[PDB]
Write an enzyme that holds these catalytic residues in place. Sequence first.
Site, PDB file in Angstrom:
ATOM      1  N   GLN A   1       0.825  -1.203   0.000  1.00 38.41           N
ATOM      2  CA  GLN A   1       0.000   0.000   0.000  1.00 38.41           C
ATOM      3  C   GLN A   1       0.863   1.258   0.000  1.00 38.41           C
ATOM      4  O   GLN A   1       0.466   2.295  -0.530  1.00 38.41           O
ATOM      5  CB  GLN A   1      -0.919   0.005   1.224  1.00 38.41           C
ATOM      6  CG  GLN A   1      -1.928   1.140   1.240  1.00 38.41           C
ATOM      7  CD  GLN A   1      -2.750   1.166   2.514  1.00 38.41           C
ATOM      8  OE1 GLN A   1      -2.471   0.432   3.461  1.00 38.41           O
ATOM      9  NE2 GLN A   1      -3.769   2.016   2.542  1.00 38.41           N
TER      10      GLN A   1
ATOM     11  N   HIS B   1       1.128   3.615  -3.678  1.00 36.87           N
ATOM     12  CA  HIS B   1       0.428   4.895  -3.650  1.00 36.87           C
ATOM     13  C   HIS B   1       1.287   6.052  -4.156  1.00 36.87           C
ATOM     14  O   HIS B   1       0.904   7.214  -4.029  1.00 36.87           O
ATOM     15  CB  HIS B   1      -0.063   5.193  -2.231  1.00 36.87           C
ATOM     16  CG  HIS B   1      -1.355   4.517  -1.886  1.00 36.87           C
ATOM     17  ND1 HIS B   1      -1.535   3.157  -1.996  1.00 36.87           N
ATOM     18  CD2 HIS B   1      -2.527   5.018  -1.428  1.00 36.87           C
ATOM     19  CE1 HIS B   1      -2.765   2.846  -1.624  1.00 36.87           C
ATOM     20  NE2 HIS B   1      -3.387   3.956  -1.275  1.00 36.87           N
TER      21      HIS B   1
ATOM     22  N   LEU C   1      -6.921  -3.302 -10.271  1.00 36.45           N
ATOM     23  CA  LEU C   1      -6.703  -4.623  -9.691  1.00 36.45           C
ATOM     24  C   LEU C   1      -5.804  -4.585  -8.460  1.00 36.45           C
ATOM     25  O   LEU C   1      -5.782  -5.531  -7.672  1.00 36.45           O
ATOM     26  CB  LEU C   1      -6.109  -5.571 -10.738  1.00 36.45           C
ATOM     27  CG  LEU C   1      -4.703  -5.262 -11.261  1.00 36.45           C
ATOM     28  CD1 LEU C   1      -3.630  -5.659 -10.256  1.00 36.45           C
ATOM     29  CD2 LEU C   1      -4.476  -5.981 -12.582  1.00 36.45           C
ATOM     30  N   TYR C   2      -5.062  -3.495  -8.292  1.00 35.16           N
ATOM     31  CA  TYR C   2      -4.102  -3.401  -7.199  1.00 35.16           C
ATOM     32  C   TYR C   2      -4.794  -3.063  -5.881  1.00 35.16           C
ATOM     33  O   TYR C   2      -4.136  -2.857  -4.863  1.00 35.16           O
ATOM     34  CB  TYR C   2      -3.033  -2.353  -7.512  1.00 35.16           C
ATOM     35  CG  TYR C   2      -1.628  -2.791  -7.160  1.00 35.16           C
ATOM     36  CD1 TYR C   2      -1.252  -2.999  -5.840  1.00 35.16           C
ATOM     37  CD2 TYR C   2      -0.676  -2.998  -8.151  1.00 35.16           C
ATOM     38  CE1 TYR C   2       0.029  -3.402  -5.515  1.00 35.16           C
ATOM     39  CE2 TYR C   2       0.608  -3.402  -7.837  1.00 35.16           C
ATOM     40  CZ  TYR C   2       0.955  -3.601  -6.517  1.00 35.16           C
ATOM     41  OH  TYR C   2       2.233  -4.002  -6.199  1.00 35.16           O
TER      42      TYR C   2
ATOM     43  N   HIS D   1      -7.433  -4.985  -0.678  1.00 30.34           N
ATOM     44  CA  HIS D   1      -7.945  -4.747   0.665  1.00 30.34           C
ATOM     45  C   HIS D   1      -8.161  -6.051   1.436  1.00 30.34           C
ATOM     46  O   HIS D   1      -8.223  -6.040   2.664  1.00 30.34           O
ATOM     47  CB  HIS D   1      -9.250  -3.954   0.597  1.00 30.34           C
ATOM     48  CG  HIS D   1      -9.138  -2.685  -0.189  1.00 30.34           C
ATOM     49  ND1 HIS D   1      -8.718  -1.498   0.372  1.00 30.34           N
ATOM     50  CD2 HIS D   1      -9.384  -2.419  -1.493  1.00 30.34           C
ATOM     51  CE1 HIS D   1      -8.713  -0.555  -0.552  1.00 30.34           C
ATOM     52  NE2 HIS D   1      -9.114  -1.087  -1.693  1.00 30.34           N
TER      53      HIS D   1
ATOM     54  N   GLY E   1      -1.117  -8.757 -13.815  1.00 27.77           N
ATOM     55  CA  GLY E   1      -0.349  -7.855 -13.010  1.00 27.77           C
ATOM     56  C   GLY E   1       1.124  -7.995 -13.204  1.00 27.77           C
ATOM     57  O   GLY E   1       1.873  -7.069 -13.047  1.00 27.77           O
TER      58      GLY E   1
ATOM     59  N   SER F   1       3.572  -4.491 -13.670  1.00 27.17           N
ATOM     60  CA  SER F   1       4.562  -4.340 -12.646  1.00 27.17           C
ATOM     61  C   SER F   1       5.989  -4.355 -13.134  1.00 27.17           C
ATOM     62  O   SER F   1       6.811  -3.616 -12.672  1.00 27.17           O
ATOM     63  CB  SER F   1       4.361  -5.478 -11.669  1.00 27.17           C
ATOM     64  OG  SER F   1       5.277  -5.374 -10.592  1.00 27.17           O
TER      65      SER F   1
HETATM   66  C1  HEM Z   1      -6.502   0.102   6.058  1.00 28.93           C
HETATM   67  C2  HEM Z   1      -6.189  -0.150   4.782  1.00 28.93           C
HETATM   68  C3  HEM Z   1      -6.701   0.703   3.598  1.00 28.93           C
HETATM   69  C4  HEM Z   1      -7.504   1.777   3.612  1.00 28.93           C
HETATM   70  C5  HEM Z   1      -8.159   2.479   4.824  1.00 28.93           C
HETATM   71  C6  HEM Z   1      -7.684   2.215   2.245  1.00 28.93           C
HETATM   72  C7  HEM Z   1      -8.442   3.287   1.834  1.00 28.93           C
HETATM   73  C8  HEM Z   1      -8.667   3.649   0.527  1.00 28.93           C
HETATM   74  C9  HEM Z   1      -9.779   4.437   0.040  1.00 28.93           C
HETATM   75  C10 HEM Z   1     -10.923   5.020   0.899  1.00 28.93           C
HETATM   76  C11 HEM Z   1      -9.644   4.576  -1.279  1.00 28.93           C
HETATM   77  C12 HEM Z   1     -10.625   5.348  -2.190  1.00 28.93           C
HETATM   78  C13 HEM Z   1     -10.841   4.594  -3.498  1.00 28.93           C
HETATM   79  C14 HEM Z   1     -12.159   5.001  -4.104  1.00 28.93           C
HETATM   80  O1  HEM Z   1     -12.777   5.976  -3.606  1.00 28.93           O
HETATM   81  O2  HEM Z   1     -12.593   4.348  -5.087  1.00 28.93           O
HETATM   82  C15 HEM Z   1      -8.441   3.873  -1.684  1.00 28.93           C
HETATM   83  C16 HEM Z   1      -7.938   3.771  -2.963  1.00 28.93           C
HETATM   84  C17 HEM Z   1      -6.972   2.889  -3.396  1.00 28.93           C
HETATM   85  N1  HEM Z   1      -6.391   1.866  -2.647  1.00 28.93           N
HETATM   86 FE1  HEM Z   1      -6.626   1.682  -0.599  1.00 28.93          FE
HETATM   87  N2  HEM Z   1      -6.965   1.373   1.420  1.00 28.93           N
HETATM   88  C18 HEM Z   1      -6.348   0.431   2.219  1.00 28.93           C
HETATM   89  C19 HEM Z   1      -5.537  -0.591   1.776  1.00 28.93           C
HETATM   90  C20 HEM Z   1      -5.033  -0.729   0.502  1.00 28.93           C
HETATM   91  C21 HEM Z   1      -4.058  -1.714   0.077  1.00 28.93           C
HETATM   92  C22 HEM Z   1      -3.438  -2.772   1.017  1.00 28.93           C
HETATM   93  C23 HEM Z   1      -3.827  -1.524  -1.229  1.00 28.93           C
HETATM   94  C24 HEM Z   1      -2.882  -2.292  -2.185  1.00 28.93           C
HETATM   95  C25 HEM Z   1      -2.090  -3.292  -1.783  1.00 28.93           C
HETATM   96  C26 HEM Z   1      -4.647  -0.414  -1.668  1.00 28.93           C
HETATM   97  C27 HEM Z   1      -4.695   0.090  -2.950  1.00 28.93           C
HETATM   98  C28 HEM Z   1      -5.449   1.157  -3.388  1.00 28.93           C
HETATM   99  C29 HEM Z   1      -5.381   1.724  -4.717  1.00 28.93           C
HETATM  100  C30 HEM Z   1      -4.481   1.277  -5.891  1.00 28.93           C
HETATM  101  C31 HEM Z   1      -6.390   2.875  -4.718  1.00 28.93           C
HETATM  102  C32 HEM Z   1      -6.712   3.814  -5.898  1.00 28.93           C
HETATM  103  C33 HEM Z   1      -6.794   5.247  -5.386  1.00 28.93           C
HETATM  104  C34 HEM Z   1      -5.952   6.139  -6.256  1.00 28.93           C
HETATM  105  O3  HEM Z   1      -5.735   5.796  -7.447  1.00 28.93           O
HETATM  106  O4  HEM Z   1      -5.495   7.197  -5.751  1.00 28.93           O
HETATM  107  N3  HEM Z   1      -5.370   0.047  -0.588  1.00 28.93           N
HETATM  108  N4  HEM Z   1      -7.869   3.322  -0.553  1.00 28.93           N
HETATM  109  C1  LIG Z   2       0.552  -7.586  -9.332  1.00 30.74           C
HETATM  110  C2  LIG Z   2       1.549  -8.663  -9.645  1.00 30.74           C
HETATM  111  C3  LIG Z   2       1.185  -9.817 -10.320  1.00 30.74           C
HETATM  112  C4  LIG Z   2       2.094 -10.762 -10.591  1.00 30.74           C
HETATM  113  C5  LIG Z   2       3.462 -10.561 -10.167  1.00 30.74           C
HETATM  114  C6  LIG Z   2       4.529 -11.566 -10.441  1.00 30.74           C
HETATM  115  C7  LIG Z   2       5.738 -11.276 -11.116  1.00 30.74           C
HETATM  116  C8  LIG Z   2       6.436 -12.378 -11.170  1.00 30.74           C
HETATM  117  C9  LIG Z   2       7.771 -12.545 -11.795  1.00 30.74           C
HETATM  118  F1  LIG Z   2       8.315 -13.674 -11.394  1.00 30.74           F
HETATM  119  F2  LIG Z   2       7.625 -12.578 -13.103  1.00 30.74           F
HETATM  120  F3  LIG Z   2       8.605 -11.578 -11.465  1.00 30.74           F
HETATM  121  N1  LIG Z   2       5.725 -13.359 -10.567  1.00 30.74           N
HETATM  122  N2  LIG Z   2       4.550 -12.817 -10.122  1.00 30.74           N
HETATM  123  C10 LIG Z   2       3.580 -13.571  -9.423  1.00 30.74           C
HETATM  124  C11 LIG Z   2       3.389 -14.865  -9.832  1.00 30.74           C
HETATM  125  C12 LIG Z   2       2.532 -15.652  -9.163  1.00 30.74           C
HETATM  126  C13 LIG Z   2       1.938 -15.187  -7.914  1.00 30.74           C
HETATM  127  S1  LIG Z   2       0.913 -16.302  -6.968  1.00 30.74           S
HETATM  128  N3  LIG Z   2       1.028 -15.841  -5.363  1.00 30.74           N
HETATM  129  O1  LIG Z   2      -0.574 -16.267  -7.588  1.00 30.74           O
HETATM  130  O2  LIG Z   2       1.516 -17.800  -7.052  1.00 30.74           O
HETATM  131  C14 LIG Z   2       2.254 -13.974  -7.435  1.00 30.74           C
HETATM  132  C15 LIG Z   2       3.054 -13.130  -8.196  1.00 30.74           C
HETATM  133  C16 LIG Z   2       3.811  -9.454  -9.526  1.00 30.74           C
HETATM  134  C17 LIG Z   2       2.873  -8.482  -9.241  1.00 30.74           C
END
Ligand code: HEM
Ligand SMILES: Cc1ccc(-c2cc(C(F)(F)F)nn2-c2ccc(S(N)(=O)=O)cc2)cc1
Lengths: 553, 553
Positions: free
Chosen positions: B172, B176, B353-354, B357, B495, B499
Amino acid sequence: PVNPCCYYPCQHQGICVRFGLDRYQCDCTRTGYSGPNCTIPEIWTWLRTTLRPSPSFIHFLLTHGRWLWDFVNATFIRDTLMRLVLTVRSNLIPSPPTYNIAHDYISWESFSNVSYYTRILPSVPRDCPTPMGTKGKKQLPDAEFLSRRFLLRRKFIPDPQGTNLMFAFFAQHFTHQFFKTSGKMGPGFTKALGHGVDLGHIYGDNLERQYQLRLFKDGKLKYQMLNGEVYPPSVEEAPVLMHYPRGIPPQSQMAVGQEVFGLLPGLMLYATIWLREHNRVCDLLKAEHPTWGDEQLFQTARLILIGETIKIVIEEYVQQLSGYFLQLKFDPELLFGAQFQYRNRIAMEFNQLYHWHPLMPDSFRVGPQDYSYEQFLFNTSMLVDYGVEALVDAFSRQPAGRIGGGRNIDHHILHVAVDVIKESRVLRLQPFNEYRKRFGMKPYTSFQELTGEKEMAAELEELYGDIDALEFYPGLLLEKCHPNSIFGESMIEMGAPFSLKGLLGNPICSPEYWKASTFGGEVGFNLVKTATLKKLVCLNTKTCPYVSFHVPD
Amino acid sequence: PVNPCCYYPCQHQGICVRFGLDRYQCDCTRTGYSGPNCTIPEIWTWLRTTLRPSPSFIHFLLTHGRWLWDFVNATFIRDTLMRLVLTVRSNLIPSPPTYNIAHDYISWESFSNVSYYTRILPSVPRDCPTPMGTKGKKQLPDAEFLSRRFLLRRKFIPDPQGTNLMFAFFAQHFTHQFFKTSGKMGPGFTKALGHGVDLGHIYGDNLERQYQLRLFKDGKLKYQMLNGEVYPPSVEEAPVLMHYPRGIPPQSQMAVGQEVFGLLPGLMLYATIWLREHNRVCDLLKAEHPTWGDEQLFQTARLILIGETIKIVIEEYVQQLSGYFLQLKFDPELLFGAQFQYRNRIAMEFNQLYHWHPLMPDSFRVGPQDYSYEQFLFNTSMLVDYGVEALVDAFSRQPAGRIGGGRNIDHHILHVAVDVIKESRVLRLQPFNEYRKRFGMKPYTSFQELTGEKEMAAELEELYGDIDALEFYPGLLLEKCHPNSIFGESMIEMGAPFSLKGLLGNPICSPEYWKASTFGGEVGFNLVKTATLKKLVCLNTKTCPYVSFHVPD
Ligand code: HEM
Ligand SMILES: Cc1ccc(-c2cc(C(F)(F)F)nn2-c2ccc(S(N)(=O)=O)cc2)cc1
Ligand code: HEM
Ligand SMILES: Cc1ccc(-c2cc(C(F)(F)F)nn2-c2ccc(S(N)(=O)=O)cc2)cc1
Ligand SMILES: CCCCCCCCOC1O[C@H](CO)[C@@H](O)[C@H](O)[C@H]1O
Ligand SMILES: CCCCCCCCO[C@@H]1O[C@H](CO)[C@@H](O)[C@H](O)[C@H]1O
Ligand SMILES: CCCCCCCCO[C@@H]1O[C@H](CO)[C@@H](O)[C@H](O)[C@H]1O
Ligand SMILES: CCCCCCCCO[C@@H]1O[C@H](CO)[C@@H](O)[C@H](O)[C@H]1O
C-alpha cells in the site's frame, strides 16, 4: 585545491566525479575505454577506430561519385546506409536525457522536469580558474566586438548549394516549436515542453490555447476569410496571446499556436499553409468516417500533419541542406530492428547552434517590388496583399545566406548573435574542442586550423589566447567549409545527431504508433508517405507557383 | 446501425476503427495475424502458439521441482529465465502508452498529457446495446450487493503463502506513489505524474512541496526528534498539505511526500524508514564528497533510494508474492541486449486490480495488546509510542489475508471495494474475458469455470447473465486460485506485465543511468545492489527485530 574536473580528464564521454578534498575519478562504464581517464582502448573499440575514416572523408563520399549513388539509391543499400546514418548518429545522444542548467549530474529532477533544456555536456565549474576551465585568457572577448568583426556581413555571400529563403523560413518556422526559451524562468528553460515535432507552433504550446484555436466542428481549426482565401482567425474571433507590436487593430492580427509568428509574414505564411492542410485533412477524414466526432477528427488530423512534417524534413529538408547524393528516406521501420529510444529532449547546444541568422538576406525581393528590413518586419497586411501562391513563388526564387565560415550576418539581426554568445556564458557551455571530442572529432591544435586562413586566425589568437578555450557558438560559424557546403564540419557533425534523434525519436515512429489505423485507415497513412513540400502548398492553393528549398538556377 | 466494434471483432490486440455508416475494419499490423479480424495465423506465430504451454502449466513449473531450481539458481539460467520473464511480460504493455479515459485511439494528447491514467484496452462505446458491449443483461449487478455477497468476509482466510502485514503495508505504501486518482479532475486522472518508482510518496509529488520537506543541508530531509528517535517533521516545522482527520490535534502530525499517510501508522512507519534511509545515505555521500553541496547530496541520495526500492521489489517483494523457486533478480543489464523502452505509464486497470484490501486482517496484534479498526485508524501517537523496531516486529509476526477467490474483505474496507467497481463503470472498462484475451489467456466459457465451484457460479449466472459480460474487478477476486497461491491466474497474468514494465522501465535501469557515477561512485552503487528489507530497517534502528514479507512459521 583546484577542481580536478576542470581539465576535462575523462575522455570519450567519461563522467568526472569529485572525491576527497582534491581528488577525482572517471567512470569509464560502457565508454569502450578503461584506465584512469578512459583513454586505453578495449579490444573491439581499438579495431573500430583503426578502421574509422575521417568525418570529412565520409562527407566526400556522400557528396561525390554520382554514378555510384544512382545505383545505391535504386537498391536496398539506400536502407543499409539510411539505418546506418540513423542509429549511428543518434548511438545510445543520451536517452534518457542526462543534464540540465541546474544539474551537472544524472538526477531524477533532470529526467522528470521538462521545463529544462537538457545538455549533452556539463557546464564549466564555477570554481575553475579560467572561465572555460583551465585554458584561455582570464577574460573572454566582447560579445558585440566578436559579432562586429567575425559575424558582421560586408558583402552578401550566398549559399553555394542554392538554398533559398523558402528553406530559410521553413527552418525558423519548424524549429521554433521546440525552442521557446522562456523569459520568465530565464535561460536554460523552455516553454515548448513538446521537445520535438509536436506541431506546438500550430496547436500548442498548451491545451487551453488549443481550444481557442479550434472551431470544434469536423475537428477543424477556426479561420478567417480575406479576399476569398483562407488564413488564421483574427484575435477577436480566436482570443489567444500574441506578441504583435504596437498597438495595431485586433481585426488585422491573425492568431496561431506559436507566438512571435505575426512578427514575420514568412512564419505566418507557413502558419497559413499548415492551417489549410489541417482543415483539408479533416475533409478527407470526415468523408471516410461520417460517424467520427470533432475530437477524433482533430487529434487524428494532428498525427497526420506530424507525419507529413518528418517526411518533408528528411526526404526534402535535409536533402537540400545535406547536398548528398544519398536519398534520405523517412522510414520508421529502419530502427524497428535496432535498439532505439523513442524519446527526445531538446539540448541547449542544439538551440545554440540552430541560430542560423546568416540565412537572412540584405532585403526581400517580391517579383518587381523590393522591401527592406524596415518594410518587411512586423508586417500585418503584406501576407493578405500578395496571397499564398504569389509569395511562395518569391521565396523560392531568392537565394539565402551561407551559414558557416562567416562573416555573413546582416547588421539588423546581429543583436541576436550577441545575445546567443551572451547566453552561452550564462549557461557556462564548455569550449569548442571539448564538444568536438564529444561528437567524434579531433580537437583543433591551432586557430589557423579552424578558419583555414591566417587573417582571422591571428585576430583570434589575440582574443581567446588558446584554441582549447574557443567558445562553442563562435567556433561553428568561424569554421571553414567544404567547397560548396553551407556550413563547417562541426555544424554537420554536431547538428546531424540532434535532429535525427528528434525526428525518429517521435512517438509516431515507434512500433506502437506507426500503424495505418493511427492515421484513420490507409487514406491518412498514405498522405504521410507521399508528403511533399510541393503538395503541402499547391493542394491548398488555387494557382501552382514555384515551391522548393532551392532557387531555380 | 449498431456500432460494429461492440462485438470486439479484432482479435489478438487488433485496433477496431469505424468506417461508413455501419461498417468497420481491423488493423492487423504486427499482431502476428491477418484477415478481416486478425484471426488467421502467420507462418511463425502458428508455430509459436502450437508450442505454447498453458499459463498454469508454466506456473506449475515455477512452483515445483525444487531440486531443478536449486540448480538453475546457481547457473546462468537464472538470467536466461529472468530476461525471459522481463522482455516477454513487459512486451504486452504498449509503449509509448496507447489510450486514456478521454480517448479510445492513439492521439498526441494521450501521449503528451500525463494527468491521465492510460489504459491497455479502449472503453465500451456508450452507443452500444448492453453496458458491456453486446453480451450480458441490460443492467449490471448492484455494486454494494456484489461486495456483500462475494467480497464480504465471514471467517478470516489467511494467505497460504505465509504473507504477512509487513508485506501488506509495503504494498500500500509503495503503490500509492503512482496511484493518486485526483478527486478534482475525477476518475481517470492522477496526481502522481511520476507514473512509476519516483519515490513521490517520499519527496513528491511536486517540487514546491519537496523543498518544504528538505532541510537544505547535507542533502537531507527535515525531521523531528521524539524519544531520541527519528521521525518525519511536524507540519509546523515543515508546513505541507496533509489529509489528517478533521479538527485533528497536532502538534504531533508528521509531514511526508504522500498525503493520506498519516491516516495509518503503517504508512507512516515506512515514511519513517525511508526517511532515516535518505539521511543515512547523505552521511555516506558527505564523507565521500566533502566538496559536494546540498543539491547534489540530496538528488543523488534520491537515486540511491529509487535503486534500493526496485532491488527489494524484485528479489524480495515479488519473491514472496510469486512463491516461485526461481530467484527473481534485479539486473537492468538483462534488457541491455533487448528492444525495450525505458518509459512507463500507469494504467487504469493496474490501479483497478491493485486494490488488495483483502490483505487487511480483522484486527491488528502488537505483542500483548490488540487494537481494532477503530483504535488503529487515524492513529497519531501509536507510531511514537511503540517505536520502529518494536512495530516492524509485530507486522512481520502477523499473517495477512488471501486476495483471490473471495470472499475475504473486512466489513470496514468494503466501501472501497464498491467504490472500485463503481469507478469501473465510470471508466467503462471492458468485460473480464476481453482482458483475458489481451493478456494471452483463453476466455472462460462459463461462470463455473471461473470460480471452480457450483454455488457462487450459479448466483452469478443470475446477475450478469453471460460470462462474456462479467466485470473486470469482480472477475479477478472471484476467480479460484491454485491451492497455495495468493490470488487467481488472472491476477498474476495481468499484473505481472504491468509491474515489470514499471520497474525496469525506470530511467535508472537504462544504459545511460545505470552507471556507478550516477550514484556517487561505487559506494552508492553497492547500496543498491545489496538492498534488503532487513538492512532497510535494522541499519536505521538500534535493536534488530523480525523483518520479512512472511510470518515466522
Ligand atoms: C486500512 C487499509 C486501507 C484503507 C483504509 C484504504 C483506503 C482507501 C480508500 C478510501 C480509497 C478510495 C478509493 C475510491 O474511492 O474508489 C483507496 C484507494 C486505493 N487503494 Fe486503498 N486502502 C487500504 C488498503 C489498501 C491496500 C493494502 C492496497 C494495495 C495493496 C490499496 C490500494 C489502493 C489503490 C491502488 C487505490 C486507488 C486510489 C488512487 O488511485 O489514488 N489500498 N484506498
Ligand atoms: C501484481 C503482480 C502480479 C504478478 C506478479 C509476479 C511477477 C512475477 C515474476 F516472477 F515474473 F517476477 N511473478 N509474479 C507472481 C506470480 C505468481 C503469484 S501467486 N502468489 O498467484 O503464485 C504472485 C506473483 C507481480 C505483481
Ligand atoms: C528576420 C529574421 C529573424 C529575426 C528577426 C529573428 C529574431 C530573433 C530574436 C530577437 C531572438 C532572441 C534571442 C535572444 O534573445 O537571445 C532569436 C533567437 C532565435 N533564433 Fe531567430 N530570428 C530570425 C531568423 C531566424 C532563423 C532563419 C532561424 C533558423 C533556425 C532562427 C532561429 C532562432 C532560434 C531557434 C532562437 C532561439 C529560440 C528560443 O530561444 O525560443 N532565427 N531570433
Ligand atoms: C542541423 C543539421 C546538421 C546536419 C544535418 C544532416 C543530416 C544528414 C543526414 F544525411 F544524415 F540525414 N545530413 N546532414 C547534413 C550534412 C551535411 C550538410 S553540409 N552542406 O554543411 O556539408 C548539411 C546537412 C541536418 C541538420
Ligand atoms: C595490451 C595487450 C594486448 C595483446 C598484446 C598485443 C600487443 C599489445 O597491443 C597493444 O596495446 C596497446 C594498448 O594501448 C595498443 O594501443 C597498441 O596497439 C599495442 O601496444
Ligand atoms: C557511408 C556513410 C554511412 C555511415 C554514416 C556515418 C555518420 C557520419 O559519420 C560518423 O558519424 C558518427 C556520428 O556522428 C561519428 O561517430 C563520426 O564522427 C562520423 O564520421
Ligand atoms: C507440456 C506443455 C503443454 C501442455 C500443457 C500440459 C499441462 C496442462 O495444463 C496444466 O497442467 C498443469 C499440470 O501440472 C495443471 O496443474 C494445470 O492446471 C493445467 O492447466
Ligand atoms: C521457466 C518458466 C518460464 C519463464 C520464461 C517465460 C516467461 C514467462 O512469462 C510468460 O509470459 C507470457 C506472456 O507474458 C505468459 O503468457 C506466460 O504465462 C508467462 O509465464
